[PDB]
Amino acid sequence: HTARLIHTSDLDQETRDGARRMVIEAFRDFTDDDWDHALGGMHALISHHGALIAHGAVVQRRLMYRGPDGRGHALRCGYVEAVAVREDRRGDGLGTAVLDALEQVIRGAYQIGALSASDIARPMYIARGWLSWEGPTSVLTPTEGIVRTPEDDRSLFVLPVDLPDGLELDTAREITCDWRSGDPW
Amino acid sequence: IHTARLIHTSDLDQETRDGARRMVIEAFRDFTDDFTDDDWDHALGGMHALISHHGALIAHGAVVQRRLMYRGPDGRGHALRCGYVEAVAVREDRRGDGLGTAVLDALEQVIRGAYQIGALSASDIARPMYIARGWLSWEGPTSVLTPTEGIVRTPEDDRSLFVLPVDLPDGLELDTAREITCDWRSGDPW
Ligand SMILES: CC(C)(COP(=O)(O)OP(=O)(O)OC[C@H]1O[C@@H](n2cnc3c(N)ncnc32)[C@H](O)[C@@H]1OP(=O)(O)O)[C@@H](O)C(=O)NCCC(=O)NCCS
Ligand SMILES: CC(C)(COP(=O)(O)OP(=O)(O)OC[C@H]1O[C@@H](n2cnc3c(N)ncnc32)[C@H](O)[C@@H]1OP(=O)(O)O)[C@@H](O)C(=O)NCCC(=O)NCCS
Ligand SMILES: CN[C@@H]1[C@@H](O)[C@@H](O[C@@H]2[C@@H](O)[C@H](O[C@H]3OC(CN)=CC[C@H]3N)[C@@H](N)C[C@H]2N)OC[C@]1(C)O
């Protein structure tokens, strides 16, 4: 099982519609906004006989972290969205293949990987070496400043790959994402 | 005719990345480079357009994903998915022969295929080229969404921005006289 990696702009609209239908069904809670969040980066795709059986995406965002010394960091983040395997093909390494391709993008292009894991996905990320975030989560809003996202506490994983020299993340500290509509994480 | 290759940052060999950075720095040339380490860093994370000829990188550009914050004339805020154009450059001795056009042709294919809006901050030099390709001059005040103050004006970026509205949400009126705000990053916000 190997995933193809393709930019959103190189994806035909029928394959985009097909990936979106496969992802909605795999979550059936996956909304229009959740799909919009998966656009603009690299998709990992696995098909069988022109049926999409696995998908994931990694999109560029800024993750804001303030160290104990008070210095702010706006990290180039590869954010993992719309990871899904068709129900009948689960427990066969398709998830592993999707994440191998998305982590290739994260390690090659970003300072840090981040995602907000569904309950069923948690064991996957733990086994791949992703760090659980235990500190409080927030979003930088345009009109209210930093606003706590308590519904997202205890859901975050990070993959520090190329942090600025001398920066080590304390996972008990606050972490902030950039503003978007729908679920910020 | 040269056609630019589109390559994600993650697919570039470190030797190719170092070469592209050195080519772009030289293209923008004091001992203080106009094109800085932060400017190169801003070009990372998205799709590069590369033109190579006989072992020389002769042209580069990149488009990276950002959020562009815009409040419409009805009071409603939008966080648009933006293809932001960085590090566009042609080696000096190859300028005026359509390489810059070929780079922007490739980057615009990315923007139109993946984003709601394109945006860039142009050298006063390059304003005619963007106007001719159908980019719109931003006339209103520019700002940056900071994590410690709120939206902070960026007056050094005023009358530098161009946008390419490719796929705005239904009923969004884009008025270029209004404020526009970028997401926060170190170095030049625009
Ligand atoms: C999450 C999901 C994509 C995983 O797909 P999958 O095909 O079941 O996953 P895989 O078989 O590739 O297994 C992924 C890895 O997790 C491991 N794993 C799975 N369940 C595990 C568990 N309970 N404990 C430890 N490891 C576990 C597997 O061993 C595998 O690692 P390995 O290849 O090293 O053995 C799938 O359950 C799904 O689509 N769910 C619905 C949509 C969803 O919630 N997605 C959220 C994405 S964050
Ligand atoms: C700006 C730059 C990328 C243009 O690339 P180029 O290959 O020289 O330009 P092209 O030949 O593709 O011409 C595209 C347009 O640029 C303009 N232009 C800019 N410099 C030009 C030059 N030296 N000769 C001819 N046209 C030039 C022309 O208006 C042209 O439109 P036209 O072909 O319809 O006449 C390039 O000259 C450069 O690297 N300069 C450094 C500044 C910079 O990097 N800006 C990037 C975005 S702000
Ligand atoms: C309360 N604790 C948590 C609970 O809130 C929830 O976390 C959500 C998480 O899945 C969401 O992301 C996944 O789901 C979808 C579809 N919605 C799209 C992308 C997927 N990566 C994220 N966008 C928002 C999180 N809040 O599940 C895990 C949890 C531990 O139970």
Ligand SMILES: CN[C@@H]1[C@@H](O)[C@@H](O[C@@H]2[C@@H](O)[C@H](O[C@H]3OC(CN)=CC[C@H]3N)[C@@H](N)C[C@H]2N)OC[C@]1(C)O
């Ligand atoms: C106030 N006057 C303005 C003046 O500040 C300047 O704008 C700058 C613009 O070039 C910069 O982008 C270019 O340069 C570099 C290297 N630095 C990288 C990518 C290039 N697209 C942008 N990052 C910041 C802008 N402030 O030129 C236009 C102007 C109107 O004259």
